[PDB]
Amino acid sequence: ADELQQRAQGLFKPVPAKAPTLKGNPASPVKVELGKMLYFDPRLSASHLISCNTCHNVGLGGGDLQATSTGHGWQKGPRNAPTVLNSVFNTAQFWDGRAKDLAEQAKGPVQAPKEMNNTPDQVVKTLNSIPDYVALFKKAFPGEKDPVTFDNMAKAIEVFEATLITPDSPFDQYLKGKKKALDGKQTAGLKLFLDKGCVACHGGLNLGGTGYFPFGVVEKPAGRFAVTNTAKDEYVFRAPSLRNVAITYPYFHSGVVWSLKEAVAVMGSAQFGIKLSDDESEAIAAFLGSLTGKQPKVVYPIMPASTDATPRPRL
Amino acid sequence: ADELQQRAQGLFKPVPAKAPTLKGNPASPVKVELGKMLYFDPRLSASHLISCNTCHNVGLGGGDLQATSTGHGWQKGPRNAPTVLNSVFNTAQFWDGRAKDLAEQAKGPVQAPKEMNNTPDQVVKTLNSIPDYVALFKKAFPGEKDPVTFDNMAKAIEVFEATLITPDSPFDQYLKGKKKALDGKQTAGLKLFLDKGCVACHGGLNLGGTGYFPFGVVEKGRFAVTNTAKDEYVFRAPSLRNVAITYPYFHSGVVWSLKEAVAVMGSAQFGIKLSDDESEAIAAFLGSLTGKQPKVVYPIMPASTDATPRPRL
């Protein structure tokens, strides 16, 4: 019946109306602003061409519209740039890896050598080179004889991301009150997302983002990609958060599947013992579309100028 | 003595505090928004990674922090990126060419930067896949059967670039009236800038961007000016508004210091001599050319669809 609503209210949870407090990283006005500038400063990279936003494009659903990201040197990477919208709520920091490696973790500072091509110390050199950024670190991180450190730099970055959230997606307004926030097809898709076992791995605050599982997608030797079992190789893949999934194509860790309907079709896997008909993998995908919230209103930061003591671009 | 002010006030002009209306390309709420998303949309490149913001960065004085530009395929360019800020005022359109080459142009191209590796066709096709964009072209150019044209899109991007201006720069304030808007060293720099003939090419509303001259900063201080009338080749005297924050300098971007570049430009060729303190004081002045950097909402850009072509890396 409409038991479905009350049901969903217990498995899922809307995105809070406001950025969550980070532990040991008190968000404040300057801190967010400094983090903002930082997220959008290509000088955090060696070339001075790549920022975070180059690959986690707030204007484009948070990702990079690439199958796999291409960083320094025009090098094509091994992985999809996952969104940065709502990342604040995931605990599973990687796509994939050995189970014995992933096992423990977390939670560390953002590190992007390879993609940005900068050692942490070079990053700290650059920051220290620009006066305005120092005055800014002192304001954001007050008690320190030295605030200009890769940890505080990360804290500030991450406090900005805390605000990159997406409240009131139609589905969130359905979990709140409005039952006709979802439409027929979408509401049909909600039920199938549940009664086919999808919420097992894609559940909670972020519809995923929280756990590792020994299943991944590959090329079939002989519809064209399929979920494989990596239990034997002691490997695991993250079950990504499905929030805003409509706007972050292409899909999976390798970005091999561009169509959202088609990606449902792969996920309705024999390995999890789920069978989907096209109408169900249609309908579900519909509901997936209901998970697109209100995109970030961001004023492009006015970043400060390099001084004679700033390292030159190493392309 | 303080009549120096009226000498400048009759040689320059401050930046208008509201975007200028362009010839047969009127502004409007919806056209500026559309112009914006186009401007931050990387899907105008074959690669899907580069946008007019990749090289003309609102957050860094409308430039790109490089000598010369990269570049689809990570491939360097021939020219330094010039600043988007106040470009709406500059009449002189390219870094450099033969005079004849540039001559017949005014009725011609626009455009498709060969840096982005798309054709005007490929761009058009891309905007025709994204239903939301299509609607915005029809709302922006409301008469027309088919508004999604390359020219209408350059027109959209133009209208929003027109909003990228930098008023209330210390100096602009100085012209507007206030005498003390410039500190000591700046007033001495402005004095010199005139007395040395700097304002001859770097004068006007944009302090340049308005003329061409057979004069090139080339390798040789490592650097110097050269006469190219011989070859019949000419170069842009560029708008030095925001010149404190748009390094490196020159066509090739070979000089990183706003002090070195001021010294390069007190040259034998112009019949000029500058002392360290003099070149150091001119820079001081050129520092006051820096205006209110634009407050601009990062646009939210419509989803791709089945039709939208795939990236070509």
Ligand code: HEM
């Ligand atoms: C220094 C600024 C950057 C920040 C703050 C940042 C942010 C993030 C975050 C928060 C995640 C985790 C996603 C999640 O945990 O749900 C992540 C993963 C990822 N990001 Fe970034 N990013 C930055 C630079 C870049 C750049 C320049 C690229 C592209 C060249 C990039 C590409 C990726 C990729 C490919 C992953 C997946 C990695 C994997 O699991 O193998 N990041 N990024």
Ligand code: HEM
């Ligand atoms: C038919 C039901 C399911 C649906 C509709 C579904 C939905 C999706 C979607 C849309 C993605 C795209 C990820 C992205 O790029 O954001 C995905 C990936 C993923 N999901 Fe599911 N999922 C289902 C079943 C499951 C189950 C039961 C599990 C856990 C046992 C799981 C674990 C994962 C993992 C590990 C990935 C990443 C896979 C890879 O990169 O190869 N999924 N899912």
Ligand code: HEM
């Ligand atoms: C449609 C997208 C773009 C627009 C609207 C745009 C804007 C402009 C403007 C307004 C100028 C002339 C400045 C003036 O007249 O004052 C210019 C020239 C220039 N821009 Fe772009 N830009 C775009 C894309 C790019 C990209 C992607 C790059 C580099 C990777 C770039 C690099 C340059 C360079 C090197 C010049 C100097 C031209 C010459 O060689 O003389 N632009 N652009």
Ligand code: HEM
């Ligand atoms: C000492 C007085 C002068 C100073 C301090 C000065 C300043 C400058 C600066 C800083 C640049 C680099 C602009 C940039 O890349 O954004 C420049 C470029 C240029 N200015 Fe001057 N200017 C002076 C006098 C003149 C005169 C008299 C002329 C014309 C006859 C002129 C024409 C040019 C030209 C042709 C360039 C292009 C250089 C190249 O890329 O080859 N300037 N000027």
Ligand SMILES: [Ca+2]
């Ligand atoms: Ca994706």
Ligand SMILES: [Ca+2]
């Ligand atoms: Ca420059």
